[PDB]
């Protein structure tokens, strides 16, 4: 969604469930070479910075698939960003 | 394919799996002197700019071999460019 | 701001939160080809030297947007440079 | 546009996204012999000086195509030069 | 304080309570992206080397705030370095 | 063509792809002693002045062969001169 | 071979492995003063233009030695030019 | 040798290593006023035309010294002219 | 063996026991400067890409020594590639 | 000392305590821009190659200060090189 | 001893008493920064891989001190490697 | 100072902190077109050779400003050259 | 100004920012045939000798326009020549 | 040795331990200005092309010193080239 | 020395450290207009041909000063030419 | 100067800094029509032959002004001619 690109500074600093987000996005978007590249730089905002590093290669039908994974994982972070 | 040459500005900015693309093209097109020349300038679009730097020496029967490597790697980037 | 251009030798040597600064400036100023060019030369002052390398193409309404990103990130580095 | 020719001293010193500008202009104006001639003299203003070196052979319907590429790339440099 | 910068080789090798030091410095200096970057490289001197990696961006009114955190934590390491 | 002789002041000042034009004309018109004589006086209009220096020895069936080489190279310079 | 002289405009624009071609031709044809003269003008077609600059001093038994070096290097560029 | 005078039209058009030929002939035949007179008219056949311009003042024991310099430089151009 | 060079794209993506492979190859092929260069870029396929980076300097009597190390380590990966 | 310059190939390959050596040399010789430049290229001999990269700017009264830091750190590597 | 360097692949995979080996080597060879670097990567062969990572900086009079520590600890692993 | 011009062969070979020297001289002497021209030719003495390339346009009140930047950066290289 | 003509030997030897001076003078005085004629003879004083080669065709209202371009570029070279 | 000059195309493409070769040749042949010039163009064959760029200034008593450094480093590459 | 004039063909082809030779000769013989004239024609033998171009204006007390600079730089090239 | 007229054959063959000599003599003796007449016939002794072509119109108070320009330029050529 454009929710992913509008809130890019908020999803770096305030997503704290990245290791579950990678499992939902695995196979559908993230290859195993992209999966292992995220699981480093152990500051938790830098795992999102590596995750948004692969986001310009994404289209609309899969950026909102990560919106579904944030709504299954958090359900309060998405709502606090919309409100 | 002419898909490689038509979408040259898109395949620079939006290919994020170059390190696997080089392995598929290794030996068939890319020599070891051409393989090592790509794996530098660590901005990921500049690895494609070095990869298209060897593309004018290619013919039709091997530019579509890189089309096969993009379809095995991405399968959504090729489809988003065609659609 | 002119604060960015006056303190250019200080913001190279003494900014230590560049990876968050790039996320705030992403999309507004830094393209993905400019975002990936900064995240190399792993000495942390050289990430600012690559960041100021794109600063002559900036106008006044966006150099102070990086002033806002330094005030959200540091809030003591900006104040120590002003005082 | 005449914007390209009026602001020639400003577009040399203050364009910092030349490597993306060459990809947009590739095939439409810049041949591969002209593309490779720009990607040298690694001072970033000299890549624009090589780019304006091919500009007297251009007509009006393609100099404004580089205006479109500056507006997609920068969008603040064009506006700061107009204002 | 300049005590932090004078004794930089001693505070790397001989601080053994880094995980409490990060909690005192959290929010006042260390962001969550800086907090998570320290909690890796599990040799305990390398957590201080990552902590001093953010110290050039600090001013005088907050380097002595880490002096207060060392005096609350250790109270013998600071005194052995002064004596 | 007479297009070559009518636009002689324009093709000196505004042809910026001379090094590719010489390769198309090599062997068909330009001998190696004429090829090397053009690749000097490094102002790019003077390479055309050396190229038109061999043009009075040309007939109609080969001056339009350089018209074909300008249409393959430029395709906007020929059209801007005709329009 | 006459393949070298017939396809002179194609081997300038479409040879992208010149740095390996010079090593195969070194000592057999190219002296060290001729080897170093090619490794400049960093547009890759101009390295072939410097390489063909020494080709009129060559005979038949060594121009086809560069044909062997193109067949070991490319093997698709020679075949695309023959077909 | 008379090889120099018999093949005068071939050594103009097909010698492409003149700058090394001048160094071998320097001091033995070419004075510094004759050395600098050759290094102009940047078409490479005209450097040989300036070199043969000093050849009527030569005797037999030094025209074959330039034959030795062509055999050290080329070794295929001399053999293609003899065969 | 040529098994190493034929299956180069498969041994990058599908070797998951690199840290034992380096110990078998240590001293016989890999120096300590080559051993430490592999143990970085913590994506496990990139440790093989660094391992094949030293493979062009190898001869036949030691590339099959790494075939012996893959047969002692895996014994199913070699058999799945042969079958 | 000249011990540093005589044993330069040995101190690259056989110093394994570089991260403590940098702390002793910090502030006295190594600036923070030089300190961060060493802590990359994670092969441990390449951290010494970056450390000797700043050694030609050193005089005699500080190269032996790194001799003192090797004697405090190792005390067997210095003695094995002297013996 | 050379027993340490000859059996390097065996002492990684088959030493299972590393935590006592580090205590015997502490102070004599291993500094506290080297002691803490070993006690991570909790696969027991990787604690030996970190221990051999400091072994190129060792001389003969202390590599056999680790031979004494293996003979006090194991006394069957050393004998099975010799026999 | 005349210290800059007297020690020109020493400041090329033995200055190893050029990237900080350029930041101190930026804006006061070095324009952005002169700043980017230095940051190439990646042999570190050639960055000083490009820096002394702009030094004949300097007067006395700014050559000693680079003396101040060498004394803040090195403080041992200036003293070793004076002594 | 007469400052241009009085200091003609100083502005040849000591102007080191010619490539920016040409951009300020482009269109106002220097045509594209005069712009390209200066950007050759790569000794930097010879670019000024080509620039003063077009200066006798100038009047007073444009020689001081190059005085403005030297004051924007250098601001210390003009002041050192006046003082 | 003449082994260095006979196998020049093989030692470019197939030497993969250049960074250790430079340390053995440092001080004996390679100056620090020649040492730093090699450690660029990060394709590993181009580091050998820069290393052979200084080889015509070498005599016989030091080209075989690089033969000793290849035999200490590789010991299989030299033997595969001889056999 | 007469060593400079006797070995003029050898010092062109086999001096590979010209950029350091110019720094030793700078100020004593080479003016800045002569220094910049050498640093072009990027074939390394042509930098010596430009250096010997200023040698007829030299006397005996400074040609042997370049002999001292070759003995400090090379020390094997001078000895191989004498032997 | 009479030094100019006595050494006329030596100042033709052995002055190699004519382009700086013309700048010192410009305006005082050499008009712009005389300045441009010297900068041709690109053998460097013929630029002195054109310079002495205007010397019979000179008196004593300006031939020694060229003696001052030779002493500022060379300072060894004048001394070698006097001694």
Swiss-Prot record, chains A, B, C, D, E, F, G, H, I, J, K, L, M, N, O, P:
In alphabetical order, the GO MF annotations are:
BMP receptor binding; cysteine-type endopeptidase activator activity; enzyme binding; identical protein binding; interleukin-6 receptor binding; myosin I binding; pattern recognition receptor activity; protease binding
Which of UniProt's keywords are assigned here? Apoptosis, Cytoplasm, Endoplasmic reticulum, Golgi apparatus, Immunity, Inflammasome, Inflammatory response, Innate immunity, Isopeptide bond, Membrane, Mitochondrion, Nucleus, Phosphoprotein, Tumor suppressor, Ubl conjugation
Principal place of residence: cytoplasm
Record-listed cross-link Glycyl lysine isopeptide (Lys-Gly) (interchain with G-Cter in ubiquitin), residues: 63
Per UniProt, subcellular location reads as: Cytoplasm; Inflammasome; Endoplasmic reticulum; Mitochondrion
Ranges that cross the membrane: none
Which tissues show it? Widely expressed at low levels. Detected in peripheral blood leukocytes, lung, small intestine, spleen, thymus, colon and at lower levels in placenta, liver and kidney. Very low expression in skeletal muscle, heart and brain. Expressed in lung epithelial cells (at protein level). Detected in the leukemia cell lines HL-60 and U-937, but not in Jurkat T-cell lymphoma and Daudi Burkitt's lymphoma. Detected in the melanoma cell line WM35, but not in WM793. Not detected in HeLa cervical carcinoma cells and MOLT-4 lymphocytic leukemia cells.
Q: Name one GO biological process term.
A: intrinsic apoptotic signaling pathway
Q: Keyword Nucleus, does the record have it?
A: yes
What turns on expression?
In macrophages, up-regulated by endocannabinoid anandamide/AEA.
User: Per the record's keyword annotation, is Oxidoreductase included, yes or no?
Assistant: no
* Post-translational note: Phosphorylated. 'Lys-63'-linked polyubiquitination by TRAF3 is critical for speck formation and inflammasome activation. 'Lys-63'-linked deubiquitinated by USP50; a crucial step for NLRP3-mediated inflammasome activation. 'Lys-63'-linked polyubiquitination by PELI1 is also critical for speck formation and inflammasome activation. Deubiquitinated by USP3 that cleaves 'Lys-48'-linked ubiquitin chains and strengthens its stability by blocking proteasomal degradation.
Residue span, CARD domain: 1-83
Q: Quote the cellular component terms of the Gene Ontology held in the record.
A: AIM2 inflammasome complex; azurophil granule lumen; canonical inflammasome complex; cytoplasm; cytosol; endoplasmic reticulum; extracellular region; Golgi membrane
Relay the record's extra comment: In breast tumorigenesis, methylation-mediated silencing may affect genes and proteins that act as positive mediators of cell death.
What the entry says about domains is: The CARD domain mediates interaction with CASP1 and NLRC4.
Tell me, what does this protein do in biology? Functions as a key mediator in apoptosis and inflammation. Promotes caspase-mediated apoptosis involving predominantly caspase-8 and also caspase-9 in a probable cell type-specific manner. Involved in activation of the mitochondrial apoptotic pathway, promotes caspase-8-dependent proteolytic maturation of BID independently of FADD in certain cell types and also mediates mitochondrial translocation of BAX and activates BAX-dependent apoptosis coupled to activation of caspase-9, -2 and -3.
- What does the annotation say about its assembly with partners? Self-associates; enforced oligomerization induces apoptosis, NF-kappa-B regulation and interleukin-1 beta secretion. Homooligomers can form disk-like particles of approximately 12 nm diameter and approximately 1 nm height. Next to isoform 1, also isoform 2 and isoform 3 may be involved in oligomerization leading to functional regulation. Component of several inflammasomes containing one pattern recognition receptor/sensor, such as NLRP1, NLRP2, NLRP3, NLRP6, NLRC4, AIM2, MEFV or NOD2, and probably NLRC4, NLRP12 or IFI16.
- What is this protein identified as? Apoptosis-associated speck-like protein containing a CARD
Natural source organism: Homo sapiens (Human)
């Amino acid at each position: 969604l454009h929710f992913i690109d509008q809130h890019r500074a908020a999803l770096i600093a305030r997503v704290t469930n990245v290791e579950w987000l990678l499992d939902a996005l695995y196979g559908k978007v993230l290859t195993d070479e992209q999966y292992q590249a995220v699981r480093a730089e152990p500051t938790n905002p830098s795992k999102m910075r590596k995750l948004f590093s692969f986001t310009p290669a994404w289209n609309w039908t899969c950026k909102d698939l990560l919106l579904q994974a944030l709504r299954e994982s958090q359900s309060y972070l998405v709502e606090d960003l919309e409100r």
